[PDB]
Chain A
């Protein structure tokens, strides 16, 4: 019963914010790490954020550092991502991904969303 769906999105003016979500069901959510991967409409993939299981250690690329905000709550069994002061080159597709091996960060990614 492993499933990953999403919410949020739409149209944001340059100078606004957007706060997404990710619904996770089926596995045990408190024993994996979770990460957002983006897909440009020009057929190219790019990485956004990741976060370990306990929620204390985050990692960020340098190209978007200090601007995005990622968090976890264990009991709610869902994932967040908070944006602020967007730009124009963010017109793309987003996804929500679980890592492969348990307790890990940064290996592969086996089950995405849609």
Chain B
């Protein structure tokens, strides 16, 4: 565990990229294809 506080910045950046691409994807591909990208709390799962 002693390594992660000198590594937390990259983790915050990657979480920010997930938030941005999730909110783009859930309104681009959202009319059709409802189960994968429909809400946002499953578009996180599909991008992961």
Which A residues are within 8 Å of any B CB, using their own CB?
Answer: 52-54, 56-57, 103-107
CA distance A54 to B38 in the complex (A): 13
Which of under 10, 10 to 19, 20 to 34, or 35 or more describes the interface residues of B?
Answer: under 10
Chain A binding surface SS class: loop
Q: Is the CB of A57 within 8 A of B32?
A: no
Give the nearest-CB partner of A53 in chain B: B35
Q: Is the CB of A57 within 8 A of B33?
A: no
Q: B34 near A: Cβ within 8 Å?
A: yes
Q: Is the CB of B35 within 8 A of A104?
A: no
Please name all residues of chain B whose beta carbon is closer than 8 Å to the beta carbon of A103 when the two chains form the complex.
33, 35-36
Q: List 19 A-B contacts (CB under 8 A).
A: A52-B34, A52-B35, A53-B35, A54-B35, A56-B35, A57-B34, A57-B35, A57-B38, A103-B33, A103-B35, A103-B36, A104-B32, A104-B33, A105-B32, A105-B33, A105-B34, A106-B31, A106-B32, A107-B32
